[model samples]
Target: RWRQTWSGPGTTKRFPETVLARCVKYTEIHPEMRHVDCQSVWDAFKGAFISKHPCDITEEDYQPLMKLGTQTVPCNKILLWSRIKDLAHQFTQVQRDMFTLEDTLLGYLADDLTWCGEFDTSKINYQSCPDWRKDCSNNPVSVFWKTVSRRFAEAACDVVHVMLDGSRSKIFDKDSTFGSVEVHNLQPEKVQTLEAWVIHGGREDSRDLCQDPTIKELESIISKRNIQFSCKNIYRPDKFLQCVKNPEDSSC
Candidate 1:
């Protein structure tokens, strides 16, 4: 059991006790996380940004927290995506073997949650938080994701799968989390191949957009890193509906 006490002016803000408990509960069920001390982990996580300026946190600040929650991922199970967050998650969820950043301990703990702390005070700010783009490098949320993404990429092994949105003009945006952080962190020695999957809504324009400059740059990066690269165009109508209805049922 864990509890957080907040004492300040108006509404005292602190990391949600419920979220902390959920993280602990998650560790209990996962065999790899059995050795982790949930309480200590939470303390370190809280210490990373609490009572500090929201835009002052760095990726290195969260290193200790990340170390506590590190776990190995199986080869060929990694699923990296850009702008296809929902579908990517659904695919991984339905296919138990697939793993994404959200499947990791830290990612699991912070998913869909927003938090920030006040300067020189223990109170957290729940009502308002800095936008991710405001202080791209130093913000709490950005730092957390960047740190996690780096670690996730470092853990990648064997053939990895990456999903990109073909509908967009640029299939792979160099500025995206996947592009800026994850791709750069991928270990050449550890990863054997990268299978880029470009998914589009319809078959008419569902051609391999891997030749696009951005994607070409991706291929170049992988090749230069000494990993094999392959790209394929995947056409699926009502992909969201299909996955939601029955992920295993791939009629389209």
Candidate 2:
């Protein structure tokens, strides 16, 4: 069985079987995705890296799996993110109109978990895996996210939203996956507006505003791509939602 116990450090345990089962779980939960062939997704996923050097993987390697799970994103509902992962998810949970990448099949099936193939075994691994940054950029996990993030961005339509954390020294980092992949991938013909929400943490003093240099850089990048760019500094409801999680804090 793919789940057979193994004593090691790189690959996720039961990754092959988990991936196989995860797709159906995702499709079942999202009725619109019922037609997705879970088996085909599984096959393409393994074909990308199983038995290959995990470090040599590339975003294009996941092309087959990407095509297998592509879904039409709702117009103006696609929400991408950089540093504000938790609050952005919470915001979407409360705001039904917004949908993050995790709402899609490929993103859903692989969300929050890490897995990779073994270069030597020609199968799966359980103990160790290449580090995305420490080991190499093309490591299986990093490549998968890059590939999926690009796919998610490709689904961008009329008005796309991205939530970034203002707590960091720079709210927008060009090195980030969103800054590097998703931003450039947003189709100019399809995307009319890119709304960047700069969200601050409850007690954070560094409030990166809409006019901040980093944000302006983002604006320039999008504008040059022929997409209108707008930004909002949020102490809005999404900020309030963060307060709800820390009601006792002074900022709340």
Candidate 3:
């Protein structure tokens, strides 16, 4: 089915607490953020995605939304960033209790008493996300990501089960990239770039980072002030992925 609607301005706005609460009121809301199926906010955002396939949510989509004016605004980057941050934050809280860095350190140091160094090892225990007092309501979206990374590091340590002598059991594979470096068999020249990116790119890729002007201009006049930057590769996947069964994943 082909959908061609005016991508005018003001067609939708950020997910309001009331609207989001209604959507969350039920569990059937798949892709809760996209809201493609729900009746309440689906029409505005879905119609935009459906009609604007090749360049969905671009300048073309914004035009019709602009037409809506102050009456109501459509979902924009600001809303998307906020939602992603909130989701990430909530996820940290849920998972933080289960893991900690000391766990990983202990897992790695358990075999060697000498690895304990001068510190009394028996007294140390694992802790969850530090009791960091973060008020996301006042901070920019970037802070949310910092909380996410710290928590993720703790989770990684738990999963890797690091041990003393820094030599881990071959089978106890956690999320750490340690083994992946050698096993993935990626191109050597490209490996450094890729590794560096994975280690350092999170800050730039977060929802609060600055984006290219081309995308920065896509926000509507009413919502521009609220716009938050994010990174995305919007090129068509089919053309690049025609060689594979799953075009989206294999393609550029």
Candidate 4:
């Protein structure tokens, strides 16, 4: 019969003295029993003494031949499913990152761009082209806005290329809940030109435009590869230009 005893914290007070005596008697009868506890202790000691990093222990570490025994091949269907799941995860991460960057760029525009508020079709000329290139080019504020916008757009193009496999159909698929998970790199393409309008404007201009030459080039490639590619605005600019500028307050 096996008996269990509880020892109080800070004191060796075993419950049910009768059971404790039986354990002691059993230990005395089988001296080899003392070695039983050693197994766990030895395991802990071995783990502590090892210098290996956890990530490095997986397959692909060490020499090619050494890795052979480590790479556990899954069944064919399972392996295929795992690959698909991994691709979906990667796609989602990219789309999420793109949207986050888009939000950040919108914030920058709202804070730095002079004409961020609602447009007065009346003040369209000055609002869109404040100084006809000459004044706008030299203006520090205008220059900063242009530089930031260009940089942001360029970075977004890079992200798009990196995240996309150049499949228009896949990108257009509304049913692709991205495998029921949000993807960081799979946001729908919005526009395709650097000079394209931001529909409304201001903070509402938080739309992803495919306005990079590289994007155009990729679109062409996809088309040539027999992939369907649409070159239209994927985002609506209804709320994009909600903030209106003060026409009378000509502070600039």
Candidate 5:
């Protein structure tokens, strides 16, 4: 019961081919995924979400697809981000060595897209699909993210990076996908240290440091889990993203 939103996509019927296309593209760009078969991917993916109540989908449902799409992310290369979504992607776009969840095969296919089952698991419900007016937490799309996200965290070894937006009083939101799913799923035995980079953005950030209580809360959460943690107040270059709104700071 995680997502309290709609049931589906912009084009329901086209979902399979779209996923098949991007599944191939994922292999193309990542290279490591070249050995993966796109058809197999769609088969496993559809097997997980379909033929069941969309809200009843779980991490268990996606187990096969997760395994099918699994790829090893080297230690210290993993970057988990929260709040500053676009900025995080922009950062990783330049720092090509860093890998984000959305860059992963399964995550890529579902990025900004949605889908769900209808009365039964086999047929997708078309009416409420585009509504965005319902509430189905354990639905297909939501579970898919949770399923892959947790697995991603579990694969971490040594140090990992988390880009946090420190522009507010609360730099961390435990309910967020990164905070809720990934952080809790991190295997402390495999993950030695968790480093957080708190960045202020194109707009002025009133809170300039990672010393916010929310940060300490995050540190506390990781501490009890037997892992080391640290934080840094860093600057993302002005040119990292467009400064269209308020360029008064003049750094760009």
Candidate 6:
């Protein structure tokens, strides 16, 4: 185990071994995970961006690491979302069988942690990392998510569900993770259909938000991909309370 102390903003963080242990444990119990070497996977993951300029890392840099470890998502169980991330996770929590990126080993270990590489010292920068918005494509965090999102989409089968916020003007923003990475990675032959669930909060009117031009563009993209596309306007009031009270309830 490699542990280092830092007087930086966040608490001291450990290196590969701790994360490796968790990954190993996760794979041990899941039938879908096999022939995985946690340490090897971590080494490749660390090497991908550890010594490179944080703002220079690309999703392609993570491709090797992603190939080393991949999970098999059951048909129709994959949940892809943007904007409504919290709500989507909440729904999945009670649904039990649903699997999001957070449910996977890589996503689980790297969920909220931040790390970058220093050009001067060529060491891990625990103190701070570039904001994702500032350098969307090259930042460590953004690249990681994009890389994983691509893989997640590639794993989707039968029917893939996307949760978007209908309350927003652009229900489907092309710049979003779902639009930019996930949707593009979805294999038409592998995925039978794309279900867009546009949700609106209780205070706002539905206003046919699903008919927004951005959503139309999304539909066009799906059609071009040769995947069946369908949109649904989900009023928050109808299912929000039911999901909150009994996330596991059959009616939810």
Each candidate's TM vs. the true structure? Answer: 0.84, 0.85, 0.18, 0.21, 0.83, 0.80
Sorting all predicted structures by lDDT, with the top scorer first, yields: 2, 1, 5, 6, 4, 3
Q: Among these predicted structures, which one has the highest lDDT?
A: 2
Q: How many clashes does the backbone of model 2 have? A: 6
Candidate 6 regions off by >4 Å?
A: 1-25, 28-37, 133-136, 237-252
lDDT of 2 at 138: 81
Across 5-110, the per-residue lDDT of candidate 6 in tens digits comes to 3222321277455668777887787767766887788888887777788778888788778887666667578888878777777777775557788888788767
Off by over 4 Å in 4: 1-102, 105-134, 157-252
Write down the worst ten-residue block by lDDT for model 4.
74-83
Tens digits of per-residue lDDT for model 1 on 6-69? Answer: 2212122445785678688888888888878888888878888889887789877797898788
Better structure of 3 and 5 per TM-score = 5
lDDT of 2 by residue, 32-102 (tens): 88998888899998888888887799877888988888788786788899977887778777646688987
| Cα displacement (Å) at residue 189, model 1 | 1.5
Selected candidate, larger TM-score, 2 vs 4: 2
Ten contiguous residues with the weakest lDDT in model 5: 237-246
What RMSD does model 2 have?
A: 5.1
Candidate 2 segments exceeding 4 Å error: 1-9, 202-208, 236-239, 242-252
Task: Name the candidate, 2 or 4, with the larger lDDT value.
Answer: 2
Q: What C-alpha lDDT values do all the predictions have?
A: 0.78, 0.80, 0.24, 0.27, 0.77, 0.77
Best by TM-score: 2
Residue 210 of candidate 4: its Cα lDDT? 58
**TM-score attained by model 2:** 0.85
